Amino acid sequence: EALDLSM
Amino acid sequence: EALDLSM
Amino acid sequence: RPLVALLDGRDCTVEMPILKDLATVAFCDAQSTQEIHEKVLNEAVGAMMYHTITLTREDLEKFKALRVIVRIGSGYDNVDIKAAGELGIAVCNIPSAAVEETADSTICHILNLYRRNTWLYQALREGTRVQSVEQIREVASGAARIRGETLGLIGFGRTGQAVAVRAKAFGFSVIFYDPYLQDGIERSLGVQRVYTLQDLLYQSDCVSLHCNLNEHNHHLINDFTIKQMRQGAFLVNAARGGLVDEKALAQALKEGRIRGAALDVHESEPFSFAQGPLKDAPNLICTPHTAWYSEQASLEMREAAATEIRRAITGRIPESLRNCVNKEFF
Amino acid sequence: RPLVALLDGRDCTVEMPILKDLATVAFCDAQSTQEIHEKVLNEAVGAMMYHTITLTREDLEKFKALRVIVRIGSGYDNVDIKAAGELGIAVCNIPSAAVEETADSTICHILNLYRRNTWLYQALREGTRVQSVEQIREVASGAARIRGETLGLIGFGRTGQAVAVRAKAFGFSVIFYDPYLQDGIERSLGVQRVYTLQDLLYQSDCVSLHCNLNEHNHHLINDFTIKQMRQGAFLVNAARGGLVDEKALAQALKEGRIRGAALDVHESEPFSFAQGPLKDAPNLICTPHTAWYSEQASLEMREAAATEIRRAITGRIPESLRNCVNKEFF
Ligand SMILES: NC(=O)c1ccc[n+]([C@@H]2O[C@H](COP(=O)([O-])OP(=O)(O)OC[C@H]3O[C@@H](n4cnc5c(N)ncnc54)[C@H](O)[C@@H]3O)[C@@H](O)[C@H]2O)c1
Ligand SMILES: NC(=O)c1ccc[n+]([C@@H]2O[C@H](COP(=O)([O-])OP(=O)(O)OC[C@H]3O[C@@H](n4cnc5c(N)ncnc54)[C@H](O)[C@@H]3O)[C@@H](O)[C@H]2O)c1
């Protein structure tokens, strides 16, 4: 899994 | 027109 | 003026100018042979027909004056050409008016399978919203690279050769099976030849039908022979419905054994999505028997057919005929 | 480990194995630039992006640590590459992972226009019953012979050249306009070159777009230039939406000035049949920006992009980069 940096 | 010979 | 009848049609607007001065041109618009005016059975010396009716030996015995049948098209499986010959009736086709049309329509089917343009069109018409790249890959899931795939052609006559010429520049390896050809075409056109149906099906990523329907290839693609195709193969049929067993194909599509299929022809025409063996089959493109059709091709073949009637009426039968297909039985 | 961010995406499953050992890989799933985590703006040294967001000079000024942007794809009109250069940011693309995919998708659009396979599919899905030959010619009305038509290509780079190679075996005459090329490609590939847009449009039966969107070709096809196309021409656009004024095209389609159009790209994505300038336009095929897509091509480009980030992080910028497109401004 990648790092979730979403808004 | 062609001759109509249909049924 | 001898009567010439178009058996399964209405429109005679191309043929009449060519014939009016030699024949009475008439139409029967018959969808079966019981719908033929008995005037035609008694008097007609020439007949024109499409693919939408079939003439058996028993049907041919009913005609009293008929001397020539011209098929407006290339396929003549719908006429018992041996019966016709024995009965004194020459049968002719128009073999080459739509070779490029058919081959372009076929390459279009193959491209529709690999790139999914038709399904993607249908997706958009059903209101699918493809905003994001994850969404693009989702809706286009299955689309595949063509370079390096094997295209296997069953039948390597006019349409089959036209398809090969077009397929090479996409990076397909072309291979064909055609047990009636002599040695040599494969060397001329630089494609590979295999010598059994099984070898063709085993080696092919995409299989395309280009053979005439005959006494020996009914249900050529069937429950047994589909199992010999590669897992996830594509099937294309722009030849004849009777070559493919639709029950077997429905099953193969549903289990995912065949990845997708494109049919221009069907065992029972006209095709409907709402009836018959392929009723709920995934990954199916169908068109309603149009591979041959274009403005120019339809004009070319109707002139050619009318020309052929003109030769039979003014000439000798069958020496005057350009494309008689039953000389052996005549 | 320096942070590398995928700006307008979620999925990082191909890129992570290639990068995990050098970078923290992150995603923003942004649909606009205001949706970018301020951590990314502050810390990210590399960015990956698709075509679904645009970076202006003002957007680029917000990044404090960024050193490289890789476009996962060929077109980079969505980035101000001059601003980026002046700001110390290298920009790269993946120019050749989908050349054959795009060219096959394009040839598929063209064939869909001439042979009407998509519309005929849609006809059958709407319950049209095509029993008779009059009915076949009716539903397929418009399908046209390809041999002898002129295919005019605007842009003759990678995709344009791929299209030409494929189009010849159908019997198209290929002609191209590309004002940025040197003399010679036309002689190499044996096609004809014209030297103005007008000459191309006048001479073409089918026009296909294969140029990058740039400062000087916005609405290249517009109300004025469409009037210079042949009456009943076909238009294909698998390049960029901004090249075509959709208001002008809607009108041309409706009046029958353009016989049919196939768009993979649109001025505003995502495309819907229920909204925008082409709302009720006849003779329109659309696909949702998929010309590039196949299993293999998507894997090839995501590896290539991840590889490019790896070079920028371990190498020199921009000497280590394979496909930097802003060296002139860097
Ligand atoms: N869908 C359409 O609208 C459309 C249009 C044109 C032709 N067709 C059909 O396509 C068929 C082929 O047309 P063509 O002009 O190429 O005909 P053709 O006679 O030039 O080619 C047919 C070839 O099939 C080969 N063949 C016969 N039986 C075979 C078998 N069992 N296995 C493999 N090969 C076999 C023959 O040897 C011949 O080489 C026509 O008979 C017609 O039925 C369909
Ligand atoms: N629909 C899709 O999914 C898809 C996929 C791949 C590429 N594309 C688009 O296609 C465009 C072309 O891609 P390519 O790889 O062939 O790029 P390329 O740079 O190899 O070719 C572009 C060519 O267009 C020419 N050109 C530029 N401005 C022009 C103008 N005003 N008139 C005519 N020719 C002009 C350039 O000189 C160059 O030769 C890309 O920029 C991208 O936007 C779209």
Concatenated DSSP letters for C67-127? -EEEESSS--TTB-HHHHHHTT-EEEE--SSSHHHHHHHHHHHHHHHHH-HHHHHHHHHTT
C214 is in an annotated binding site: yes
C189 to chain D, any CB pair closer than 8 A? The answer is no
Q: In whole angstroms, give the CA distance from residue D161 to residue D157.
A: 6
In whole angstroms, how large is the CA radius of gyration of chain B?
6
Does the beta carbon of C210 lie inside 6 Å of ligand 1?
Answer: yes
State the pairing for strand pair C150-154/C206-209.
Answer: parallel
Q: Give the residue among D219, D206, D236, D214 at the shortest CA–CA distance from D103.
A: D236
Exposure of D21 in the CB half-sphere (CA atoms within 13 A): 5
| Chain D residues with CB-CB distance to A7 below 8 A | 28, 30, 35-37
> Which value in Å is the resolution of this experimental model?
2.6
Q: Which atom of ligand 2 is nearest to the CA of D197?
A: 32
Alpha-carbon separation of residue D223 from D220, D229, D245 (angstroms):
10, 11, 7
**Sign (positive/negative) of CA torsion D169, D170, D173, D175?**
negative
Q: Which of residues 1-7 of B touch C (CB under 8 A)?
A: 2-7
Does the beta carbon of D240 lie inside 6 Å of ligand 2?
Answer: yes
Q: In whole angstroms, give the CA distance from residue C269 to residue D129.
A: 10
Q: Would you call D37 and A2 a contact, using CB atoms and an 8 Å cutoff?
A: no
The catalytic residue positions of D are 240, 269, 289
C224 is in an annotated binding site: no
The 3-state secondary structure of D9-67 reads: CCCCCCHHHHHCCCCEEEECCCCCHHHCCHHHHHHCCEEEECCCCCECHHHHCCCCCCC
**Close Cβ partners of C172 (under 8 Å, ≥ 6 residues apart):** C146, C149, C150, C151, C206
Phi then psi for residue C124, to 5 deg, are: -65, -35
Amino acid identity for residue C15 in this structure:
E
Phi then psi for residue C297, to 5 deg, are: -70, -40
DSSP string across D282-300: SSEEE-SS-TT--HHHHHH
Amino acid identity for residue C282 in this structure:
P
Q: In whole angstroms, give the CA distance from residue D238 to residue D222.
A: 17
Q: Which of helix, strand or coil describes residue C36? A: coil
Are D101 and D292 within 8 A, CB to CB?
A: yes
- Domain ranges for chain D: 1-98+293-326, 99-292
Q: In whole angstroms, give the CA distance from residue B7 to residue B5.
A: 7
Number of residues that make up chain B: 7
Q: Which one of D106, D159, D289 would you pick to mutate in the ligand 2 pocket, going by the greatest count of ligand atoms within 8 A of its CB?
A: D159
Q: In whole angstroms, give the CA distance from residue C281 to residue C287.
A: 15
C212 is in an annotated binding site: yes
Q: Which two tokens stand for residue C224?
A: 């047994």
Q: Identify the DSSP state of C166.
A: H
Q: In whole angstroms, give the CA distance from residue C124 to residue C139.
A: 10
Are C225 and C207 within 8 A, CB to CB?
A: no
What is the C125 CA–ligand 1 centroid distance (Å)? 35
Q: Return the residue matching tokens 């995934």.
A: C282
First to last CA, chain B: 17
Q: In whole angstroms, give the CA distance from residue D148 to residue C318.
A: 35
Q: Identify the DSSP state of D244.
A: B
Residue C52 CB coordination number (10 Å): 20
Strand partners, D175: D152, D192
- Interhelix angle C158-167/C99-115, rounded to 10 degrees, is 50
Q: Give the residue among C143, C93, C322 at the shortest CA–CA distance from D296.
A: C143
Are D321 and D312 within 8 A, CB to CB?
A: yes
Q: Would you call C30 and B2 a contact, using CB atoms and an 8 Å cutoff?
A: no
Q: Give the residue among C37, C63, C43 at the shortest CA–CA distance from C1.
A: C43
Q: Which two tokens stand for residue D266?
A: 């649109």
**Which technique?**
X-ray
Ligand nearest to the Cα of D94, by number? 2
Phi then psi for residue C178, to 5 deg, are: -155, 95
Q: Measured between CA atoms, how close is C147 to chain B, in angstroms?
A: 52
Q: In whole angstroms, give the CA distance from residue D154 to residue C118.
A: 25
Q: Give the residue among D208, D257, D1, D20 at the shortest CA–CA distance from D105.
A: D208
Q: Which of helix, strand or coil describes residue C180? A: coil
Q: In whole angstroms, give the CA distance from residue C185 to residue C121.
A: 39
Alpha-carbon separation of residue C25 from C4, C10, C21, C173, D263 (angstroms):
5, 11, 10, 49, 46
Strand partners, C261: C235, C284
